[PDB]
Design a protein around this ligand. Structure first.
Ligand SMILES: *[C@@H]1O[C@H](CO)[C@@H](O)[C@H](O)[C@H]1NC(C)=O
Lengths: 373, 72, 373, 72, 373, 72
């Protein structure tokens, strides 16, 4: 819910910069001369930055030394038809690259096999100026690399087509991460109104980074392979470590945990990594079921939780939820719901982006106003 | 060990620990090239079927090159 | 605007569960022995659920009994070229599946023809644990089925490639649905400020479901056929039927209609199923026009509505809107705008997610606060 | 008849009745298999062009199998 | 931040209307007779509107006069395999169009090369009822045209398959535009709390249009060429021109600039067209660096700005930002931060969508409340 | 010139002037047709391999047309 606090930045600024440096008079001939010998070479660009350069497809060689010599020599009628298919190969790639650039306005999100093959991508990763740990990580997760990289069509001139493949740089690796799931926490009185609801808004991913915590509010922009969380530092805030205290105690004086207040008595289900949170309010049907034995639990009104062990389905009203069957150990920290600490008549019925201290200050203000009489 | 998860009924929220980080701290650009040919676009007899097919393929290739040129 | 109230859930949890059970030592030989006879078979998985299994492509048979026998027998030169094309067929599917899984990180959001053909998809639908009406509905809208289903690449070992195609289940069918469109309702006083705006926030789809109403706030995540509304119960709240009273009268005591208050005097247009609502405030030009007659109506300040009969275009300021020219009957329920019922000095100048009763209670509180002096 | 619509000027809101439901109530998983072949490094005389084409296709197939194995 | 104020509208209403007009008795025969002579013709539809019509692929001619004569002559024995490939050509386009429509449920959001080739699209643009400037603009940026246009599958009958390609019009051209970037502006006192933050919410694009200003809050839904800004008037609000005064003076009485108040002391970076704004608060490390010389600036606490000349990278905490290397002139307007004009005790700690007059007036409210005691 | 940018430290905000407009403001529809053939079901001996390939291509074509008819 904290996506508006993030700063905005240009994602393809580096690739576009390399392109603008690639338009200089004599830079395409530089790259072509460098790749005249082999299919890959390090080239110092006119801006000073040294980039790796790949020749992934050679059509001038094939066209000018294998197809046109046999075609327009004498008796232009050709004797073998395997040349037609051999030319349909090695040319589909150019057509598909052209079409991908046409439909994606010249810069394509995840980098396809047509843009860059797995052998070429691994060869590019292995020859990068990074530590061996990042090389191993990138080589094992080539799919996440493709998802997190761009390909900007750069220039086409001097018989050469150029595009910049802008790959991620996984500088921070192997630090502990944790996901935070939240759900509305309301009172369970039978009255139609006067039912106050409180929720935590700091949901999303958190990772240790240089003594601080990189927090990602839009958890949708974070991929998970096995237990590794690939995130983008640009879609993130940077917070002190004390924010983690919000889990051991939400009233601690060090960090102020952002919350949200409302009066909407809505039953919901939030599926976590290993289990499910169920906020069952009103006359709604809340059910936990196993695939082979049917319904095994009926939820009482309030905020409850079940583990993914033995539970395969969570039903809330008409919504059906399949729980993640990932293995692990779950823990239930018993405690009294915080919502039982406030007065329903003095509680701020609506505040989108607030915190514990802010709500407490408004409560202090209203109580000081009331006490004067 | 492995992935663990704690559910706090106090604040109605769950935390899932045990994951590892791989953060995009930066970028690495790399120029990738495809060498093209300026084939002389004519002069053969369109009497054969194989030659007509090769000529159509050449039309496809040059139209691709032209489309790429129009991306500026 | 109520997209934040719904709970979050894992979409591919079922497919991921079926994958995790296929990684057990064995379980692949089970499927292989079951498919040893035919190309389709029901297999009891080690987790107990019995799943249907298809062998959509036989490459071991073709490669090892039709191509390699003729190749590595003697005289490796082949005499016919139709074998080359016959092998380009029946192999494009595997390559395309591999590439789709590589670019999409192993899970594709629309199920392509390469993953599952229409004949195979219809055969799978017809052998599903659903009623014949649901079978007919799925068979007539196979494209919407492909749009609402996933395909998770599962495992590749023991000379077998496996992926789980996770299809939608249309349990609720033929129940009446209705969409609710809303627009800001402001006052039309001549002052530049002090102009209060009120809006209904319950916009979206509503469908009868098990005596309750499944409500979908993000109507953009719902596809529409001729008059059939395909939605996902996971992107939905479950409400009592009395919410419908919010249409016949918004002040009824049974249900409390969620609203929103603001002070932003912005002219807007909301195009409905058959017609257009125009909230024309400020000094903005609001126009209703026919294709062949030009401007045919000028809107006065306030909230007005026009039918799609005779009106083909709605212009607000510089924005042009094409109205849906679909057949139907429109009705204009005359009534006084609700915004004229509140005092501008007691009106809550900003409240995102509120209701009628909440606004009335805050008015009572503020009036008691003012009266104390 | 089929579709109707009512506009309430009272609350500035429109309701569009007459539609029918098709709601995703659940899921149905289905395992789909492809029987593969383990080419054990073939070897034959590459004198024909069609044999070269078949070898290129075999290389494509083996590269596909290896790519599928590498996403694990 | 003002993306919620926009109205909703049907995007493909015009194409769907032309489709509903194509189902009338005789309209497809009309189009076929019009295209009987050439491959392009202007047709006056029964709806009054005159549309351009293209015959992009002729298979009936080829199949019925080049394939069926040779196939079913004596015993369908074929003598040459080049016929198979010649039929794989001229047929791939129909299959790809079918697949594109099947996966997208009949309406595709970017118009691909399969739907309409670049030659056909340019031929269609050049014969449109638009001025020569609009023709030149559309012809130079065909990729943006494809990105902002639809293709609605219309009808298939009378041996003809028809789909309507719904192209943009670009009515407003060459008028001056300007982008507005915003960043949080907080105080820099050393206390952990009591730190007020102010931000501008009117970020996004602005263009002059018919004496008014078309404002686009979702600047991500605007593509940018060299210096041309392609936006959609539907993703826009319409404001008076006086809004531009919010740049020359933010306390002017004519226009009221919408702002946002908070108390979140979070360091952020906002990259603009030619430089970067850095809001460095707390104990966060904020750095400006050149590619070849390393760190060249360390930011003090507050809101500062750097130009893209000499600065290639901005680091905030652990987040790295690459600056756009686009050519231009930057200017630094020195002035006192507005946040130093308010009392921290009277400042509204939370208001998402507010304005200068609203926040300033609420300050009067709270000050009158405090002074009464 | 061609582009300027001003940073107001007063309100911590930047303005980027010098751009030109291209606003949609409307739509232009255009009917695009593809002439199809309703070839009648053949009946001949599928003994040749090239004839089998042509039969497969005809099946692909008819199935595409059938999907398109069935897509309404
Ligand atoms: C705030 O201060 C005084 C009220 O006595 C007045 O001069 C000023 O106009 C007020 N501004 C408002 C109410 O916006």
């Amino acid at each position: 819910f904290l996506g508006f606090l993030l700063g905005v930045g240009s994602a393809i600024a580096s690739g576009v910069a390399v392109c603008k440096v690639l338009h200089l008079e004599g830079e395409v001939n530089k790259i072509k001369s460098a790749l005249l010998s082999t299919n890959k070479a390090v080239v110092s660009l006119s801006n000073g930055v040294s980039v790796l350069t790949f020749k992934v497809l050679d059509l001038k060689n094939y066209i000018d030394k294998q197809l046109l010599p046999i075609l327009n020599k004498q008796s232009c009628s050709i004797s073998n038809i395997e040349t037609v298919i051999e030319f349909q190969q090695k040319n589909n790639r150019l057509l598909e690259i052209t079409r991908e650039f046409s439909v994606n306005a010249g810069v394509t999100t995840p980098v396809s096999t047509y843009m860059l093959t797995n052998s070429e991508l691994l060869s590019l990763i292995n020859d990068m100026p990074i530590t061996n740990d990042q090389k191993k990580l990138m080589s094992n997760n080539v799919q996440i690399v493709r998802q997190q990289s761009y390909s900007i069509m750069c220039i086409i001139k001097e018989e050469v087509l150029a595009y910049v493949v802008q790959l991620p740089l996984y500088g921070v690796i192997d630090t502990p991460c944790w996901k935070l799931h939240t759900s509305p926490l309301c009172t369970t009185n039978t009255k139609e109104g006067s039912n106050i609801c409180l929720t935590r808004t700091d949901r999303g991913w958190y990772c240790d980074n240089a003594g601080s915590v990189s927090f990602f509010p839009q958890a949708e922009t974070c991929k998970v392979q096995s237990n590794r969380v690939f995130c983008d530092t640009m879609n993130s805030l940077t917070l002190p470590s004390e924010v983690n205290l919000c889990n051991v105690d939400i009233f601690n004086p060090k960090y102020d945990c952002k919350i949200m207040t409302s009066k909407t008595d809505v039953s919901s289900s939030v599926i976590t990594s290993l289990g499910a949170i169920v906020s069952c309010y009103g006359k709604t049907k809340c059910t936990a079921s196993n695939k082979n034995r049917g319904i095994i639990k009926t939820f009482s009104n309030g905020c409850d939780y079940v583990s993914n062990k033995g539970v395969d389905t969570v039903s809330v009203g008409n919504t059906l939820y399949y729980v993640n069957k990932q293995e692990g150990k779950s823990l239930y920290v018993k405690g009294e719901p915080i919502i039982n600490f406030y007065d329903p008549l003095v509680f701020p019925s609506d505040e989108f982006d607030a915190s514990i201290s802010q709500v407490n200050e408004k409560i202090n203000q209203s109580l000081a106003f009331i006490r004067k009489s | 060990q492995n992935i663990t998860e704690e559910f706090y009924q106090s604040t109605c929220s769950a935390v899932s620990k045990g994951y590892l980080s791989a953060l995009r701290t930066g970028w690495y650009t790399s120029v990738i090239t495809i060498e093209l040919s300026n084939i002389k676009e004519n002069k053969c007899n369109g009497t054969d079927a194989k030659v007509k097919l090769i000529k159509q393929e050449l039309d496809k290739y040059k139209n691709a090159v032209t489309e790429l040129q129009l991306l500026m």
